[PDB]
Amino acid sequence: DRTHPIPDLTGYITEGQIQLSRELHRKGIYPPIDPLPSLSRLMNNGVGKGKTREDHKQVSDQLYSAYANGVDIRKLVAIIGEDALTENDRRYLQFADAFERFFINQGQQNRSIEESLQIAWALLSMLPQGELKRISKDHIGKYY
Amino acid sequence: DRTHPIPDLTGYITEGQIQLSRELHRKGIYPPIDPLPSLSRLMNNGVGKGKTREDHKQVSDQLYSAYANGVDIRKLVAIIGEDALTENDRRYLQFADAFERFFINQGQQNRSIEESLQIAWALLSMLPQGELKRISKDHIGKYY
Amino acid sequence: NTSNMPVAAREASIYVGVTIAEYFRDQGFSVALMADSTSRWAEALREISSRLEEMPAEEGYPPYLAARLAAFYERAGKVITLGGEEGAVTIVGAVSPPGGDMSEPVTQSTLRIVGAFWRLDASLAFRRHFPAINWNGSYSLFTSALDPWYRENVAEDYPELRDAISELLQREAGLQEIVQLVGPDALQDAERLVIEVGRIIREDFLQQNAYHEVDAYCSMKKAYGIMKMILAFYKEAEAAIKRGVSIDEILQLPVLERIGRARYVSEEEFPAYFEEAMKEIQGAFKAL
Amino acid sequence: LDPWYRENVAEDYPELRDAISELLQREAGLQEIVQLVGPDALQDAERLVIEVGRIIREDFLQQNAYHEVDAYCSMKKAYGIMKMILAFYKEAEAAIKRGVSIDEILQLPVLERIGRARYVSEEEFPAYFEEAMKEIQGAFKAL
Amino acid sequence: MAVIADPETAQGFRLAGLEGYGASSAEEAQSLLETLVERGGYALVAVDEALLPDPERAVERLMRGRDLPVLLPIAGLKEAFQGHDVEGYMRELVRKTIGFDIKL
Amino acid sequence: MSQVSPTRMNLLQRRGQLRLAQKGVDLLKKKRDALVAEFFGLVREAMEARKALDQRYAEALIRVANTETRLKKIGEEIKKTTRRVNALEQVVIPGIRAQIRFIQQVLEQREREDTFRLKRIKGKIEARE
């Protein structure tokens, strides 16, 4: 229960929170991080040029948006069938699997932020470049 | 919460209750009186011939019944669609809007009981005469 | 620990038992300590505490209970006894909350200590699914710890098989939640197949008959063999659908009824079902 | 506070903000319906209301705290921008009522100027009212 | 499939090899539906819309059934085409859906 | 009951209406798909049909409605008691999540707040003693 007084009062003491979920763990997704409940409550204070890399916020935003869309599309596949999904939606559906297989999953392994951004850009290539709404063109040209 | 112990215990101390509702206020109906939750505990002691007018109880009963039916039909419209509503139900649906627009709403204005009964009869005309179950024929002939 | 007995005796009963348990493990025996139950032990202790005028807390229980209960469960473990040799005391404690509330005393404090929890589910029981253990609400902390024993002595694919079945059950749970909203009519064949196999896992595997002379105990060798029959039926099911085989055709596949009674077979005739499954699907690849 | 505005800034302060709020209120209702039945069935009258509602949101509600000018919007500037938007609304509804294509109004040249009005630090902003009227006339001309 | 149309047209569908049946009224035509339905072999009956102005009430009456022919009103009379009964069929179909008698 | 009812309750509710919503946008997409195969059917129809009127020439006729009749056959009634299908359906369905949602919150109202006048009363007995 994340509303129990103990965990609930701890949230204010943090700059970054990583929330793990049993439901996600039971789907075999490890690390079992809830991508819609983990926050850089202070993330923006530890990223960018001179800290990580200038494209870090854009890449994080795009991966989060694409993974969330991809997860919703898993629901849509169940509703309509895989074959009735549009070509564009199929790419987002596939991106969610790629995010889980390659970005979330680590074979125990100490990834540098450079390594993590590289995997992020590699999986992002699965999406149409025209569908990268949250990455400014300056970063696409320099990093894609 | 009208069930909170304070407002709930106050009901017994009254001869007339006027209950205002936020939902109604948000629909722009002022005064925001819930026509199916406002009662005269002692209303019958202050109405009729020699007090207001002989048709007052009948008109009040018919307006209350028609407004309550009309409000339920707003739910039915949401369930089935406007076009699937019967002709008879459509009249009751419309009566609820007429009651709110013309009877509840006053442009700040001191209405005599004669003025209020006149508006009541005017809106009642929207209903089929055959559907005025709560008004004796003597009153329909004399006042309709 | 009867009701006519003082709260004192019932309080001491777990300590007398654990000591006797530790005594047998010292010999080099593996002993099981079964504690009916600690809810009643905490009620006997609360009676003694209140009589001693100790300050009541939550549900009027004394503050001292959590550290004590933990200290009890800490005496559990497999050890290298005095003078070498190995022995162990495994503890299985019953949990009886005041009534479904599942808070204090018993449950709350216990579920925080124990590494394993087998949740008997009254709804699973009413549905005649035995053992009535909820495979969604139960947990253990040892899967990786014991996987190598299974891989080396029973089957190389033990861990992968149970992970795959659990993902099946996990997917079913998600699907059933959605169906609860939008109904089952919109379900694709792929999703209907997952529910079909998910159901076979629940009925043919999870459910076990404690009253049957055979299914009362399921040897390790039998557990994996039944798992591979189910998982092999799954792969074949998904493979047939991908080739436009009607799910209705798979749902009434003759081998299915045999897979359903597999828990009752005491001979390996069970792994033969794998080949019986494959040929039957071929007869479905034939008719198309 | 309406009387302070009426006496010191503009006689039509209250009527203007009530009218803009009714616009935003109507947009909210329209967007809820569109969420259901899609936007294809929308009449020109409803498309115009969304067009002007959007201009209110982008040209008025939104303010740039980082811009040296739009960081603060004087009372005098607030009403003048409001009247440019409300005047564009009246003209928009008036043009539609006379069968002017909404697509013709949507690409009206003055619109881009109305969009950058929050960045102007001179009354050149109220001049947009006359610039709006003549431009609609050029749309009354072409019909 | 059968086609139910005015007699001249029905004749023309026959000369083309199709199974056209001639009628000149809503009622006559419903009769024709019932004979076809009872007689049994058709999967679809395409009917001039002038002859099938109420095809739900039409099904309603055919019964009892038993597995029905799809019933397909298709547009007529002569002056009924030289309208556009498309513009208004569309007004109704969007209101129908979203709920909104939109200003087309 | 009491606790536990607490959270599965409303995620039946919240997670379960997030995906009733989502069948809603699905079906207005079908909206736009369906209505465009709707008019064109319409098109040739109006079409050489009355090419039929002024009428070998026997097919300006069934040639006509082999084209004419077929096209509007699929499109015309397959195309929507099934179109008007898709979308007429799944919406009394965000009705489910709708008023029935009022459901979960009078339910939830009722007791994390009621269950609390209470953890605290009992405190209150020997909390007060």
Ligand SMILES: Nc1ncnc2c1ncn2[C@@H]1O[C@H](COP(=O)(O)OP(=O)(O)O)[C@@H](O)[C@H]1O
């Ligand atoms: N049988 C009834 N017919 C019509 N109105 C009634 C009836 N019973 C109650 N009411 C309405 O409810 C008001 C309160 O009723 P009452 O019996 O006094 O409340 P309580 O349940 O608190 O005793 C009445 O004054 C009247 O307006």
